[PDB]
Amino acid sequence: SDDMINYINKQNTTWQAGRNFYNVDISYLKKLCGTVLGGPKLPERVGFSEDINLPESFDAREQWSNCPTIAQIRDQGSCGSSWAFGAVEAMSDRICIHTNGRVNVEVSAEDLLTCCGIQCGDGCNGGYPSGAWNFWTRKGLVSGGVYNSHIGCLPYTIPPCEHHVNGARPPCTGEGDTPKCNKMCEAGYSTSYKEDKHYGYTSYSVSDSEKEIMAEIYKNGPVEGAFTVFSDFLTYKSGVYKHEAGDVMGGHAIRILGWGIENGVPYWLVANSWNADWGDNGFFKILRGENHCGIESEIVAGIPRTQQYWGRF
Template sequence: MYNNLNNYLGVIFATIFLLFSWYPLLVDSQIYPTTPVGCSKVSYSAEKLATIPASFDARDKWGDCISPVRTQKGCGSCWAQVTSGLLADRTCIATNGLVKTLLSPQYILGCSNNCKEGGQCNIGCRGGYIDVTLAFLESNGVVSDVCLPYQANDGSCPSTCSNGESISNATKVKAGKCYTYASLQDVQYEIMTKGPVIATFALYPEFSDYSGGVFVRTSNNIKEGHAARVYGWGNENGVDYWLAANSWGTSWGINGHFKIRRGTDEVGFEDNFISADANTDDLSETLYGSTWSNPSSGSALKPSFYLILTIIAYLILVPLFQSFA
């Protein structure tokens, strides 16, 4: 009996090792929070800053111009998710809601291998830099998610869409100049007049378990870096917060969104706000009148992490229990 048990335990540990080697944790994401370069610093007038309300939600002002929450799955693609999401949001806002086109984080993963001075480069599912990526979106642009659906892998830079159609400048959406901000009030005014911005921050284990309320760090164990689209602010039970969209699917947090304490630089959230304008001059006429498509969420060949665990548990535990019968 003990030999059988040892054999099964060996199989269990080997299976777990292979499983986690093959499939990264669902919530892993990598972003490198560095001081942005090549962006203009914005400072609004005191008169404009005086108009900032106590609370704001871009979804209330611009309706559904805030694009749907995406699911990055087992790929550290938050940097590609937030930059494509930001550009989609701002393009919709800049066209008064006439262009609602989800943009392809997969294209950014495969094509934006740009580097900062000093050799710091975007490296697909292992991480990237927001300022470098926004510069790529300004010079090169990005195709739609329909053209190149998300596969949750590095991939390569394609010359055709998944349906075989050629990729050209006419099929891309481009960003304008990127910006950073002189103060948190400047960030707020930017959000309420132009749309979402991006925040990079340190990721702590308890953030994965967030399900509501205002997030405040409780541990000292930095896991890695992350990024999110910030589109509002408010106050809950006396605590000021930022309102943001994550890229871990709608089952996480508040339907994929979260609130994080504002004014205390919680987990470095307020260190490096950054954004970019939408370039509407070169938009293809075919994009006008478009509506949000259902976000692609990865290759159909890669099943859910929980489904894998369920199948493996069944195949291993049932024979194990039968051996004791």
């Protein structure tokens, strides 16, 4: 309802609002916020920021241009899979970063969404980012591109929904069920699913310390994190998101990949998985520092087990 978009703009807040969705059923917006918050956390990382001389601004993208993934923007469709996307997005980034761009793959959102089982949650109905990472360690995940990309072993099977256009009336609606874990690479991929699994050494929590999260990103790479979604976030267009109005939608995970200061306001550079046309080309900035919406509460990350790539790369 446009009324809010205007109230927001009229407030003269750190961010600028506009309309991102057309012809969408509430259920869709609900399924978009696919993250059950407050899950049991992983053991916290030692902490080491004190040594790293953190710059004022960072952007993983510029830092590791040799890693295309760090700018790729996925689409979760009408599935409450963000918990999964934020994970595999960060994972793909690190595999590259940690191998100096010699190894570059797209970790399958599909494999995680369907094969994790109960350990992660309820697939398309929302899951826990913690489990996703803890799974990457135990059973690993194969490669897999975007919907109909035919890239990798298991591309995402849940179809996109052009919620940014306007025409074909069938309103997007958060439906569908979590597909069955078909442990089998798409016909045409030349290598056994079992022999495609990419593993990680270990997954961990990052304290809710602004400086610590910063060090983790700068040293080891982009990380997953979740936050509370409020109606108005849905209208983000640019600027530094600072919850101004609207009620609570639900939780939502994402990939934090940088920080900086804009117009005095400190901000986290975040990549959303609501299709490349949402907000600032798929990305958005949120208030940094004062644990806004809990953006600094549930930081998860991991280090890709580099070993299995040597003899092959």
